[PDB]
C-alpha cells in the first residue's frame, strides 16, 4: 500500500497527504497531473506555498520549512512533498 | 521506554541538520561518475599528471574490467594503450605489478585479447617477463597464459619479431638452472604448451624443436628431483612436440622413455600420470620407442598397473600405450604375462564411454594377434 | 595434424553485420516467439 | 546508444563459440573417417585371405 | 575505487585494504553457499589469520571430502608430515582414526611407506595389534586404491598373527601375499 | 516504461538459438545469406 | 551535451548551472549526492535557498520565483533546479 | 543459481559497523574473535 | 548516524563487485576446462591414427 520512507509532519497531515495522493492516483494517468493535483490541494488546504515532485527515479536535496516534509511511496511511485 | 523515546527524538533532530557544505575532495581521490561518465573519465584519469592518481585509477580499472559490459565499454573507450604505456614505465615497480594484474583482468574476454594484440601488448608482456621484480613476472605470466586461450593470440605469438617462444623457453631453463623457483617455470611451460595447440602449429613446432632444441632440455627437466608440476609441464610439452617424427627420434635418442615410464604407477597424482602416459603413447609410435619401453626395467608392469576404469584419461592413455607397444614381437608375451588380457577385457566390458570402449577393443585385438590377416575388432 | 586433418574454415565475412542488426531488432521488438519474429524479419529483409 | 554494448557482448559470444565448435567437430569427424577408412582396408584384406 | 559520501566527517576513516578483505570474504561466501554463515565466517577468518601468521584447512577439507564434531576436528588440525598427524592423533587420543588414516594415506608415496606410516601413527613403541592394522589397511579398500579387496584382506589376516597378538613391521613385510604389494 | 540500461530483457533461449543459427551458416558458408537465413528460420517456425 | 528543455534564467547563470551539473556528474555516483552538490553550490554563490531534483523519470509542479528556474538534460539525467 | 545468501547482507552490514567502530589493526583476527563471540 | 551512509554504500558496492567477479571467473575457468577436454581427446585420436 503506502509506506512513508521519511516524514516530518503531524500524523494528521501525513494521513491527509497519503489520502490526497491515493485520491489523485484514481484520476490522473500522467505524472505531472498528480504533481499538479497534490500541489493545488495542499495550496488551498494549508499556507499557500508548496512543492511536489512525483516519479519512479529521482534523488533530491530540498531545503524545506520545518515541520513540513514527506517522502513516501504509493504502489511503485515515489512522491516527495514539501514546503519552502 | 523513556530513554528509547528520547534517543529516537534526538536522532530525528540530528537527521534534519542542514549540513554546512560539501567540502572539496582532494586531488588524489577517484570515484565513478554517474552511469557512462566513468568509462571516458577513467581513460582520462589513466593519463593524468600525478603518479598516485594513475595507480589508484589502475585499481579502479581493475574494478571496472570485471563485467563483460564494462569491459566492452572500457576497451572501446581506449584503455589498453594507457595500461600498456603504464606497464612500460620502469621507474616504479609497484605500478608495473598493478598494470600487469590489470592486463590479466583485461585479457579475459575476446575483445580484450584482440585489442591487446593489436596495440603491441604481447610484446610489452614479453619484455616485462624479464623485469627484475618478482610479483610482476608472475602476473605477466598469468596474463600471457590467459591471453593464449584464443587461437588468434597463439598465432600472433608465433610470428611477432623473430624469437618470442624461443627466449621464453630460454628464460624457463635459465631460471630453473639458477635457483629453484618453480611457479614461474611451470607457468612458462604451460604457456608454451598452449602455444603448441594452435590449429596450424607447423611454425610453432618448427621454431621450438629446430632452434630451441627443446627435447634434451625437457629430458633433463623430467628427472624425479624437480617439483612434480614442473615434471607435469615438461611431460606435456614433450607429448605435444612428439607429433613430429623427428621429435620422436630425438626423444628416444636422448632417452626420456624410461623417465616417462617412471611416472606411471597407481600411486601418483592423476594429471602427471595422464600427461606422462600421453607422451609415451605419442613416442611409442616409433620403433625405438617400443624397444625403449620394453628395455626399461619396470615399464610394462607399470603400464598394465595403471589400467583402471576410473581416472578416465589416464586409462585411455595407458590403453593407447599398450596398443602401441604390443605391435612389437616379444612385447605381446610380456603383456599377456602381466595380465593385460583380463584387465583390458574388463575395461572393454564394463565401460560405456564410447572413445575408451574403442580404445579397449583396439587394445584387445592388438594384444592377441600373431598373423598379418587382422581379426574383426571386438564388438 | 598440421594440415592433413585441419580444414581451414572461416566466418563468411559479411555475417557479423547481419547478426548484429538481427540482435538489435530482437532486443528492441521483444516478441513472444523468437522463431516467428525472425522468420518475418528476414522475409521482409529479403523483399 | 544504450543497447549497443549488450549487442556487442552477445554477438561476440555467439560468433567465437560457434566458430570454435564447428572447427572442432569437423576436425574430429575427419580423423575418425580416416581411421574408418583404414579399418575398411583391413577388413577387405581379411575377406580376401578367407576366400583363398 | 574510493568511496566517499558528500557528508561524512573525518572522525570516521576507512582503513586501507578493508575493501579487498570484504571482497574476498564475500566471494568465498557466495561460492560455498553455507547453511550457518556465522560459524562459517569464524572458521574462515581463523583460517586466514593462521595462514598469514604462520595450509591446514585446505588439506583438512580435501581429506574430509576424500573420506566421504567436524568443527572440533578442524580446530585440532589447524593447531598442528607424519609428526603433525601424530600430534593431532595424540590430542585426539582415540570418524577420528579414519580421518587420520586417510590423511596419512593421501600424503604417502607408495604402499610400503603408507604401511610404515600406519605402524608409526596408529600405535607408538614401534608395534601395534594385528586386527587394528588389518582394519587400518581395509580403511583404504575400494575407491581408494586397487588390490585391497576383501579377498586380499582375508589372505593378509591369515598370513598375519592372531587378532590379539601384535604384528611388527618385519613380521608384516615377510608375510604371505604382502610382498607382491610392495 | 524503459528508462535504464538494465531494463532490457535478454531471453533465456536466445543465445542458444543464435549459436545454432550461426552453426548452419558456417556449415554451408553460402553467399545469399539473407535468403538461406529466411528459409531456415521459416522452416524452424513452420515445424515448431 | 545540455539540452535545456525549459529554462527561466539569464544566460550566464544557465551556463554556470550546466557547469555545476557537469562537475556533479563527474565527481559523484549516487543521485542524491549530485542533487546536494548542485543545491549547495548554488546556495553558496547565487542566492541562499535552492531546490534540486536529479533523476530519469519525474516531472514536478513547483512554485519558483521568477528569474530562477531550469529543467535540462545532461548526459542521460534530467536536472530540475529552482529557488523558492 | 549463483545468488547471495538470503541472510548475508545484514551480517556484513553489522560486521562493517563494528569494524568501523573499533578501528583494528588486524581485520582477520578481529573477524575471528567477533564471529566466535557471536556464535556462543 | 555518522556511520550510516558510508556503511550502506560500502556494503552494497562490495556485495555487487563480488557477485560479478565470481560469475565472470566461473565462466572463464569453465571455458578453459572445456578447451582442455577437447585438446586431450584430439591428441589421443591423433596417436591412434598415426599408429594405423
State the DSSP string of F1-48: ---SGGGS---TTHHHHHHHHHHHHHHH--S-HHHHHHHHHHHHHHH-
The Cα B162–Cα B144 span in angstroms is 18
The Cα E40–Cα E33 span in angstroms is 10
The Cα E130–Cα B274 span in angstroms is 37
8-state DSSP, B31: -
Q: Where are the domains of chain H?
A: 1-40
The Cα B191–Cα B137 span in angstroms is 13
Breaks (C-N over 2.5 A) in chain G follow: none
Per the DSSP assignment, residues forming a β-bridge with A59 are: G54
Q: Could B72 and D9 be called an inter-chain contact, meaning their C-beta atoms sit closer than 8 Å? A: yes
The CA distances from residue B339 to B344, D10, H39, in Å, are: 9, 54, 58
Inter-residue contact F8 to D6 (CB < 8 Å) = yes
Q: Which residue has the cell 598427524?
A: E85
Which is it for the CA torsion E133, E135, E140, E145, positive or negative? Answer: positive
The Cα B378–Cα B375 span in angstroms is 9
Which is it for the CA torsion B71, B72, B77, B79, positive or negative? Answer: positive
The Cα I42–Cα B192 span in angstroms is 18
Q: Could B18 and A63 be called an inter-chain contact, meaning their C-beta atoms sit closer than 8 Å? A: yes
The Cα B310–Cα E143 span in angstroms is 9
Q: Which residue has the cell 600424503?
A: E107
Q: Could C16 and D11 be called an inter-chain contact, meaning their C-beta atoms sit closer than 8 Å? A: yes
Non-local (6+) Cβ contacts of G72 within 8 A are G2, G3, G4, G5, G6, G7, G17, G18, G21, G78, G79
Q: Name the CATH architecture for the domain at E9-51.
A: Up-down Bundle (1.20)
List phi, psi (to 5°) of B160: -140, 90
Chain E interface, mutation test: which of B33, B263, B267, B304, most E Cβ atoms within 10 Å? B267
Q: Check if E110 contacts B (Cβ < 8 Å).
A: yes
Q: Where are the domains of chain F?
A: 5-47
Pairing of strands G77-82, G51-58: antiparallel
Q: Could I47 and B282 be called an inter-chain contact, meaning their C-beta atoms sit closer than 8 Å? A: yes
Burial class (CB in 10 A: 0-12, 13-18, 19+), E58: exposed
Instruction: Identify the three-state secondary structure at position C5.
Output: coil
Q: Which of E92, E156, E150, E155 is nearest to E121 (CA)?
A: E92
Q: Check if D31 contacts I (Cβ < 8 Å).
A: yes
Q: Could E1 and B308 be called an inter-chain contact, meaning their C-beta atoms sit closer than 8 Å? A: no
Inter-residue contact B347 to B315 (CB < 8 Å) = yes
Q: Which of H22, E43, B27, E8 is nearest to I10 (CA)?
A: E8
The Cα H4–Cα B87 span in angstroms is 36
- Please give the biggest Cα pair distance in chain D: 78
Q: Do chains E and B touch (3 or more CB pairs under 8 A)?
A: yes
Which chain B positions have a beta carbon within 8 Å of I36's beta carbon? none
Neighbouring C-beta atoms of residue E182, cutoff 10 Å: 11
The Cα F34–Cα B97 span in angstroms is 49
Which chain I positions have a beta carbon within 8 Å of B285's beta carbon? 47, 50-51
List phi, psi (to 5°) of A65: -60, 140
The CA distances from residue E99 to E59, E77, E94, E106, in Å, are: 11, 11, 12, 11
The Cα B108–Cα B121 span in angstroms is 14
Q: Could G27 and B33 be called an inter-chain contact, meaning their C-beta atoms sit closer than 8 Å? A: yes
The CA distances from residue B180 to B177, B188, B229, B230, B269, in Å, are: 8, 14, 13, 11, 22
The CA distances from residue E181 to B306, B344, E61, F6, in Å, are: 14, 21, 29, 63
Q: Which chains touch D (3 or more CB pairs under 8 A)?
A: B, C, F, I
What distance in Å separates residue I3's CA from the closest CA in chain D?
35
Q: What is the DSSP string of B66-77?
A: SSHHHHHHHHHT
Inter-residue contact F15 to D13 (CB < 8 Å) = yes
Topology (CATH level 3) of domain F5-47: cAMP-dependent Protein Kinase, Chain A (1.20.890)
Non-local (6+) Cβ contacts of E100 within 8 A are E85, E88, E89, E92, E121
List phi, psi (to 5°) of I20: -65, -45
Q: Check if A7 contacts B (Cβ < 8 Å).
A: no
Q: Which residue has the cell 533530491?
A: A60
Which chain B positions have a beta carbon within 8 Å of E108's beta carbon? 267
The Cα F48–Cα B230 span in angstroms is 54
Cell numbers at B333, concatenated: 608375451
Q: Could E9 and I9 be called an inter-chain contact, meaning their C-beta atoms sit closer than 8 Å? A: no
Which chain E positions have a beta carbon within 8 Å of B60's beta carbon? 1
Count Cα atoms within 13 angstroms, Cβ side, for B367. Answer: 26
Cell numbers at A35, concatenated: 504533481
Inter-residue contact A51 to G84 (CB < 8 Å) = yes
Q: Could D34 and I48 be called an inter-chain contact, meaning their C-beta atoms sit closer than 8 Å? A: no
Task: Supply the angle between the helices E70-78 and E56-67 in degrees, to the nearest 10.
Answer: 140
Q: Which of C5, B206, B360, B378 is nearest to I43 (CA)?
A: C5
The Cα E157–Cα E160 span in angstroms is 5
Question: Which range of residues forms the domain containing residue A64?
Answer: 1-84
Provide the CA B306 distance to its chain's centre, in angstroms: 25
Neighbouring C-beta atoms of residue E36, cutoff 10 Å: 11
The Cα E30–Cα A46 span in angstroms is 53
Q: Which long-range contacts (CB under 8 A, 24 or more apart) does B277-280 make?
A: B277/B303, B277/B306, B277/B314, B277/B317, B277/B318, B277/B321, B278/B236, B278/B239, B278/B313, B278/B317, B278/B320, B278/I40, B278/I43, B278/I44, B278/I47, B279/B235, B279/B236, B279/B238, B279/B239, B279/B242, B280/B317, B280/B321
Q: Which of E59, E70, E25 is nearest to E44 (CA)?
A: E25
How was this entry determined? cryo-EM
Amino acid at each position: 500500500k503506502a509506506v512513508i520512507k521519511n516524514a516530518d509532519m503531524s500524523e494528521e497531515m501525513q494521513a491527509d497527504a497519503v489520502d490526497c495522493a491515493t485520491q489523485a492516483l484514481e484520476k490522473y494517468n500522467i505524472e505531472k497531473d498528480i504533481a499538479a493535483y497534490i500541489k493545488k490541494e495542499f495550496d488551498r488546504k494549508h499556507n499557500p506555498t508548496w512543492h511536489c515532485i512525483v516519479g519512479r527515479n529521482f534523488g533530491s536535496y530540498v531545503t524545506h520549512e520545518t515541520k513540513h516534509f514527506i517522502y513516501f511511496y504509493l504502489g511503485q511511485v515515489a512522491i516527495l512533498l514539501f514546503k519552502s | 521506554d523513556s530513554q528509547a523515546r528520547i534517543q529516537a527524538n534526538l536522532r530525528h533532530i540530528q537527521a534534519f541538520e542542514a549540513k554546512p557544505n560539501p567540502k572539496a575532495l582532494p586531488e588524489t581521490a577517484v570515484t565513478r561518475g554517474f552511469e557512462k561518465v566513468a568509462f571516458p573519465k577513467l581513460v582520462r584519469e589513466l593519463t593524468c599528471d600525478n603518479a598516485v592518481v594513475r595507480k589508484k585509477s589502475l585499481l579502479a580499472a581493475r574494478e571496472l574490467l570485471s563485467s563483460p559490459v564494462n569491459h566492452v565499454q572500457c576497451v572501446a573507450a581506449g584503455a589498453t594503450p594507457a595500461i600498456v604505456a603504464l606497464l612500460q614505465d620502469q621507474t616504479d615497480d609497484e605500478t608495473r605489478y598493478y598494470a600487469a594484474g590489470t592486463l590479466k583482468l583485461l585479457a579475459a574476454k575476446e575483445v580484450g585479447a584482440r585489442d591487446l594484440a593489436q596495440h603491441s601488448g604481447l610484446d610489452a608482456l614479453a619484455a616485462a617477463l624479464e623485469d627484475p621484480s618478482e610479483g610482476v613476472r608472475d602476473e605477466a605470466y598469468g596474463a600471457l597464459i590467459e591471453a593464449a586461450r584464443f587461437d588468434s593470440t597463439r598465432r600472433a605469438l608465433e610470428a611477432c619479431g623473430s624469437g618470442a617462444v624461443l627466449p621464453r623457453l630460454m628464460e624457463l631453463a635459465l631460471l630453473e638452472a639458477q635457483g629453484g623457483a618453480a611457479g614461474r617455470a611451470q607457468q612458462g611451460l604451460v604457456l608454451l604448451f598452449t602455444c603448441t595447440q594452435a590449429r596450424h602449429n607447423a611454425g610453432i613446432l618448427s621454431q621450438l624443436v629446430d632452434v630451441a632444441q627443446a627435447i634434451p632440455h625437457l629430458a633433463g627437466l623430467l628427472k624425479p628431483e624437480l617439483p612434480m608440476p614442473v615434471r607435469h609441464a615438461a611431460a606435456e610439452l614433450l607429448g605435444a612436440l612428439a607429433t613430429r617424427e623427428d621429435a620422436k627420434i630425438q626423444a628416444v635418442q636422448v632417452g626420456a622413455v624410461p623417465l616417462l615410464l617412471l611416472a606411471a604407477s597407481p600411486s601418483v597424482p592423476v594429471p602427471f600420470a595422464t600427461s606422462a602416459v600421453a607422451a609415451l603413447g605419442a613416442i611409442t609410435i616409433r620403433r625405438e620407442g617400443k624397444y625403449a619401453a620394453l628395455e626399461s626395467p619396470g615399464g610394462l608392469a607399470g603400464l598394465v598397473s595403471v589400467l583402471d576404469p576410473c581416472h578416465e584419461q589416464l586409462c585411455i592413455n595407458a590403453m593407447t600405450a599398450v596398443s602401441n607397444v604390443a605391435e612389437a614381437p616379444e612385447a605381446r608375451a610380456i603383456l599377456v604375462a602381466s595380465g593385460a588380457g583380463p584387465k583390458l577385457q574388463h575395461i572393454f566390458e564394463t565401460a560405456t564411454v564410447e572413445v575408451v570402449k574403442r580404445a579397449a577393443a583396439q587394445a584387445i585385438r592388438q594384444c592377441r594377434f600373431k598373423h598379418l590377416p587382422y581379426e574383426v575388432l571386438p564388438g | 595434424m598440421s594440415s592433413t586433418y585441419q580444414k581451414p574454415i572461416t566466418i563468411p565475412g559479411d555475417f557479423p553485420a547481419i547478426l548484429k542488426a538481427f540482435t538489435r531488432e530482437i532486443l528492441r521488438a521483444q516478441p513472444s516467439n523468437i522463431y516467428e519474429f525472425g522468420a518475418r524479419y528476414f522475409s521482409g529483409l529479403q523483399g | 546508444f544504450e543497447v549497443e554494448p549488450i549487442l556487442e557482448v552477445l554477438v561476440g559470444k555467439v560468433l567465437e563459440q560457434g566458430l570454435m565448435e564447428v572447427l572442432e567437430e569437423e576436425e574430429l569427424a575427419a580423423m575418425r573417417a580416416h581411421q574408418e577408412h583404414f579399418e575398411q582396408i583391413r577388413n577387405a584384406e581379411l575377406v580376401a585371405t578367407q576366400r583363398m | 575505487m574510493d568511496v566517499e559520501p558528500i557528508f561524512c566527517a573525518e572522525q570516521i576513516v576507512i582503513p586501507h585494504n578493508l575493501a579487498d578483505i570484504l571482497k574476498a570474504y564475500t566471494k568465498e561466501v557466495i561460492r560455498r553457499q553455507p547453511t550457518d554463515l556465522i560459524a562459517f565466517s569464524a572458521k574462515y577468518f581463523t583460517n586466514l589469520a593462521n595462514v598469514a601468521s604462520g595450509a591446514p584447512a585446505k588439506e583438512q577439507l580435501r581429506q574430509v571430502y576424500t573420506r566421504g564434531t567436524l568443527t572440533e576436528s578442524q580446530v585440532t588440525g589447524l593447531c598442528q608430515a607424519d609428526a603433525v598427524v601424530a600430534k593431532v592423533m595424540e590430542v585426539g587420543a582415540f570418524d577420528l582414526s579414519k580421518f587420520v588414516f586417510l590423511c596419512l594415506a593421501m600424503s604417502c608415496e607408495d604402499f610400503n611407506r603408507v604401511c610404515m606410516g600406519v605402524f608409526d601413527v596408529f600405535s607408538d613403541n614401534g608395534s601395534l595389534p594385528a586386527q587394528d592394522l588389518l582394519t587400518l589397511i581395509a580403511h583404504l579398500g575400494p575407491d581408494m586404491d586397487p588390490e585391497v579387496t576383501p579377498a586380499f584382506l582375508d589372505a593378509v589376516a591369515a598370513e598375519l598373527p592372531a587378532g590379539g597378538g601384535a604384528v611388527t613391521y618385519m613380521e608384516l613385510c615377510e608375510a604371505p601375499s604382502l610382498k607382491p604389494k610392495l
